[PDB]
Amino acid sequence: SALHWRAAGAATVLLVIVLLAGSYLAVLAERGAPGAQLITYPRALWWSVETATTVGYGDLYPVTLWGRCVAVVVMVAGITSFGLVTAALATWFVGREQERRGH
Amino acid sequence: QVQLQQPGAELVKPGASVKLSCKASGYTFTSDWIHWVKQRPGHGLEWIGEIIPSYGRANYNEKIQKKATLTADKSSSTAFMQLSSLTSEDSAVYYCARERGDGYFAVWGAGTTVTVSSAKTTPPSVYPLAPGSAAQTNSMVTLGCLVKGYFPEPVTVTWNSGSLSSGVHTFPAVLQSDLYTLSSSVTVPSSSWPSETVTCNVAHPASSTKVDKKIVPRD
Amino acid sequence: QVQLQQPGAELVKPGASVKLSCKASGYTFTSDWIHWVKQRPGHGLEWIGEIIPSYGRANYNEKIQKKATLTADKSSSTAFMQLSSLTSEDSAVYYCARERGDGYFAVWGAGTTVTVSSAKTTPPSVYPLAPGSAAQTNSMVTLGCLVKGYFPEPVTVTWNSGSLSSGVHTFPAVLQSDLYTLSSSVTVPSSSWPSETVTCNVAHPASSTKVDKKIVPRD
Amino acid sequence: DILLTQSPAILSVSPGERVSFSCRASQSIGTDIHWYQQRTNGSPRLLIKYASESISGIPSRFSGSGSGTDFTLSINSVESEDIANYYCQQSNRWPFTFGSGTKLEIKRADAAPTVSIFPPSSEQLTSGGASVVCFLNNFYPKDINVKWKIDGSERQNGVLNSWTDQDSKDSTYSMSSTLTLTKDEYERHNSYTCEATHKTSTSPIVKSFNRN
Ligand SMILES: CCCCCCCCCO
Ligand SMILES: [K+]
Numbered sequence: 001s002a003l004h005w006r007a008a009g010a011a012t013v014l015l016v017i018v019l020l021a022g023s024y025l026a027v028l029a030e031r032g033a034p035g036a037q038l039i040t041y042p043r044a045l046w047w048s049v050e051t052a053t054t055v056g057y058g059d060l061y062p063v064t065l066w067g068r069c070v071a072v073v074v075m076v077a078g079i080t081s082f083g084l085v086t087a088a089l090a091t092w093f094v095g096r097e098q099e100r101r102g103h
Numbered sequence: 104q105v106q107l108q109q110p111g112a113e114l115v116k117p118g119a120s121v122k123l124s125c126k127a128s129g130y131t132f133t134s135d136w137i138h139w140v141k142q143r144p145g146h147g148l149e150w151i152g153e154i155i156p157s158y159g160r161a162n163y164n165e166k167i168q169k170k171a172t173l174t175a176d177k178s179s180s181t182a183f184m185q186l187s188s189l190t191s192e193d194s195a196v197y198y199c200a201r202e203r204g205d206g207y208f209a210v211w212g213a214g215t216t217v218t219v220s221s222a223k224t225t226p227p228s229v230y231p232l233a234p235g236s237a238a239q240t241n242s243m244v245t246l247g248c249l250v251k252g253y254f255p256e257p258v259t260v261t262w263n264s265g266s267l268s269s270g271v272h273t274f275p276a277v278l279q280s281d282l283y284t285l286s287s288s289v290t291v292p293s294s295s296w297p298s299e300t301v302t303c304n305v306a307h308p309a310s311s312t313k314v315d316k317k318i319v320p321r322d
Numbered sequence: 323q324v325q326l327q328q329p330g331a332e333l334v335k336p337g338a339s340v341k342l343s344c345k346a347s348g349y350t351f352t353s354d355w356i357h358w359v360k361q362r363p364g365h366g367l368e369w370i371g372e373i374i375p376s377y378g379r380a381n382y383n384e385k386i387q388k389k390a391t392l393t394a395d396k397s398s399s400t401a402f403m404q405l406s407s408l409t410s411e412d413s414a415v416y417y418c419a420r421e422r423g424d425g426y427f428a429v430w431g432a433g434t435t436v437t438v439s440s441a442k443t444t445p446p447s448v449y450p451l452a453p454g455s456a457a458q459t460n461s462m463v464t465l466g467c468l469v470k471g472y473f474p475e476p477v478t479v480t481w482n483s484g485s486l487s488s489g490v491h492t493f494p495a496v497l498q499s500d501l502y503t504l505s506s507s508v509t510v511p512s513s514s515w516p517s518e519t520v521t522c523n524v525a526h527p528a529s530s531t532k533v534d535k536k537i538v539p540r541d
Numbered sequence: 542d543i544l545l546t547q548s549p550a551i552l553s554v555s556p557g558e559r560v561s562f563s564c565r566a567s568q569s570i571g572t573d574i575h576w577y578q579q580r581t582n583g584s585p586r587l588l589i590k591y592a593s594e595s596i597s598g599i600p601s602r603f604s605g606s607g608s609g610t611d612f613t614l615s616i617n618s619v620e621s622e623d624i625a626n627y628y629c630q631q632s633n634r635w636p637f638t639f640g641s642g643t644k645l646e647i648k649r650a651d652a653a654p655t656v657s658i659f660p661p662s663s664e665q666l667t668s669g670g671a672s673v674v675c676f677l678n679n680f681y682p683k684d685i686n687v688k689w690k691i692d693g694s695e696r697q698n699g700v701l702n703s704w705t706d707q708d709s710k711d712s713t714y715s716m717s718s719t720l721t722l723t724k725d726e727y728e729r730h731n732s733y734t735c736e737a738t739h740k741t742s743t744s745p746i747v748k749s750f751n752r753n
Contacts, residue, residue, distance in 0.1 A: 024133070024134070027134075027204065028155065028158055028160060030635065031153070031162050031635050032160075032162035032635065033635060034165065034542060034634075034635060034636065035634055035635070036634065036635045037633065037634055037635075039206075039632070039634075039635050040204060040205050040206045040632060041134050041204040041205065042205060138637075140585075140639075147628070147639060147640075147641050147642050148585065148628055148639045148642075149639070150636060150637055150638065150639060162635075162636070164636060165636070166542065198584060198585070200585075205632075206573060206575065206590075206591075206632025206637070207575040207587060207590045207591075207630070207632060208575075208577070208585070208587060208630070209587060210587075211584040211585050211586070212584065213584055214584055228665075228668070230661075230662040230664055230665045230672070231662050231664070232659040232662075232674055233659065234657070234659065235658070235659070235660050235750035236750075237750060237751075238657075238658075238748070238750070245655065245657040245676060245678065247657075247659065247674070247676065249662070249665070249672055249674060249719075251672070269710070272676075272678060272705055272708070272715045273705075274703040274704075274705055274715070274716075274717040275703050275704070275705065276703075277701045277702075277703055277719075279701065284701070284719070285703065285717075286674055286676075286703075286717050286719070288657075288676050288678060288715065288717075290655075290678070321660075322663075384593050384604070384605070384606035384607075385606045385607075385613070387559070387604075387615075387617050
């Protein structure tokens with residue numbers, strides 16, 4: 001398997017790991033802060049997904065310093081992972097077009 | 104099996120401290136949180152704090168003076184709550200409860216009754232309560248046991264090691280001269296007694312004692 | 323054409339169950355939801371539940387004891403509501419309504435009157451109400467029909483198969499000795515009667531009966 | 542922090558009747574409300590989670606509803622075993638908080654008390670003490686009066702009473718009355734009598750015994 005496909009797969013697995021770890025850590029960081037809502041694991045996982053995809057509905061979000069640092073890691077991991085898939089798709093099209101041109 | 108095991112009672116002199124324990128069994132997950140709740144007699148439930156064993160972090164109720172310090176031992180699956188510098192205001196039942204990280208207390212411990220007093224521990228004296236010779240029996244007969252002179256609360260009274268539950272009333276204890284007293288009532292078909300034995304079992308956690316008293320007709 | 327067809331009535335003995343039906347016609351979309359609403363006499367509308375025929379999933383009002391189970395048959399375009407273990411509290415008119423998935427009930431069925439009672443079904447006796455021989459007529463004349471001894475509710479009374487609507491009053495039924503009784507009033511120009519016929523049509527859904535009674539002047 | 546208001550604090554219902562407990566949150570908490578039952582001297586027990594989700598092991602009789610700020614816990618056809626205190630608890634925001642609780646009270650048919658009197662035990666007398674115990678069991682309403690008489694003369698000193706909470710077995714109440722005297726004081730008296738006066742009768746229910 002070519003590099004871009006392997007890297008894409010790896011990025012997906014790493015993203016799932018970041019989502020799970022981020023969910024666990026977000027609850028750890030937010031409980032103890034009066035008013036915080038990102039405090040149970042099921043909704044924290046949902047929050048991690050809508051954060052990684054950059055949707056950000058606003059139904060849930062961190063209010064503490066550490067919860068926000070966790071959020072930044074989730075954001076960057078999501079953007080980087082989806083960006084890498086785009087890059088892999090571009091490489092695929094580039095390779096195919098070269099062929100179609102006889103190269 | 105009992106998911107959370109807590110000791111029955113703890114007597115603490117004013118100003119001293121005590122460490123309560125909560126031994127957990129059953130499934131355990133990295134997402135479990137162990138909570139502690141305080142309940143004074145006749146009053147509601149008050150949240151004290153929580154701890155996540157997998158990480159060791161603890162959070163506390165900000166609205167109340169901090170009397171507790173929570174810790175947890177992963178190898179023994181036991182959570183602890185250190186209460187320090189106690190006063191009579193700290194006397195209450197302290198429950199531990201388990202939450203799977205999803206917001207509700209799936210299960211609770213039986214609770215530990217903490218009494219803050221200078222008085223000394225005293226096991227109860229258990230006396231039989233059998234009808235007088237002139238008492239006329241109906242299709243049912245009422246027997247009982249008197250439990251007096253014990254301290255501190257509580258005592259657990261069962262009949263025939265627990266096999267007898269229906270027809271049982273245990274009255275709230277009354278405090279007099281630094282000692283408690285209560286009686287328990289049991290009613291069984293008049294024909295079954297004394298042919299079928301009736302015994303009350305009195306356990307006093309604070310003194311680590313448990314005695315039995317068979318109820319037989321008067322001489 | 324009638325978009326939602328529901329049977330007129332259902333008599334159910336206390337403790338028994340009944341299955342109400344709602345036959346739909348007109349345009350049907352995968353996004354349609356069929357709702358059921360309960361209305362006790364003199365009271366408001368209460369939402370019971372909903373079902374989406376295209377998928378078969380049903381949701382219910384959580385605020386009330388669940389008496390219904392909703393199902394739907396796609397091939398016959400019919401929705402059903404099974405009400406079980408009924409009591410007099412369940413006696414009411416049950417409407418079915420169609421929502422195109424956009425929040426409002428575009429159309430409603432005529433409703434099914436459900437009566438929970440041990441009493442037996444009884445068709446009504448229809449008697450004529452013509453003026454006495456000494457009654458002086460004005461430019462208008464009032465006639466009517468007496469409908470008594472029927473059970474359970476309801477009965478539908480029309481005049482001249484429905485062609486006569488103006489000048490018609492149908493009084494609420496009164497319950498006496500497990501039987502209902504009501505009268506309907508009709509007023510037409512004094513000159514048109516008896517030259518032009520006047521007949522009342524009484525339908526009693528519960529007994530599957532419908533009778534006609536021509537109103538003619540007394541002998 | 543979220544305040545959970547449970548009012549009324551006490552709810553009186555007749556047997557087999559449907560009952561509804563109220564819980565109002567100071568702000569919207571979605572469906573993040575859970576209900577617990579706590580019987581006399583028992584630990585709290587989860588009944589309903591996330592406003593309306595059933596818990597295995599709990600009678601179908603129990604159900605919950607609501608979302609936002611107003612929630613309800615309902616019991617279809619209440620029975621004696623439902624006698625207890627009910628608490629709501631929220632988990633929408635930190636910290637979790639509890640409502641102040643509502644007690645369920647059942648209004649059953651009147652019942653005269655079953656009276657039993659017991660002479661002090663020989664084991665107790667051996668210690669220089671003498672307790673005469675009287676049980677006024679399973680009566681309703683809970684309003685009741687007990688009177689002690691020694692040798693026909695009303696006695697008040699040395700008497701301590703205790704009343705149970707409504708019983709989750711039959712919705713009745715019970716009371717104990719204990720007359721404690723020294724062996725000596727006890728030895729110089731003949732008959733001891735306990736009299737119960739309850740709404741169920743114009744005349745008192747009396748039980749006695751002679752030390753001989
Ligand atoms: C990525 C930031 C570190 C993980 C969160 C730590 C929280 C410590 C307790 O407040
Ligand atoms: K975006």
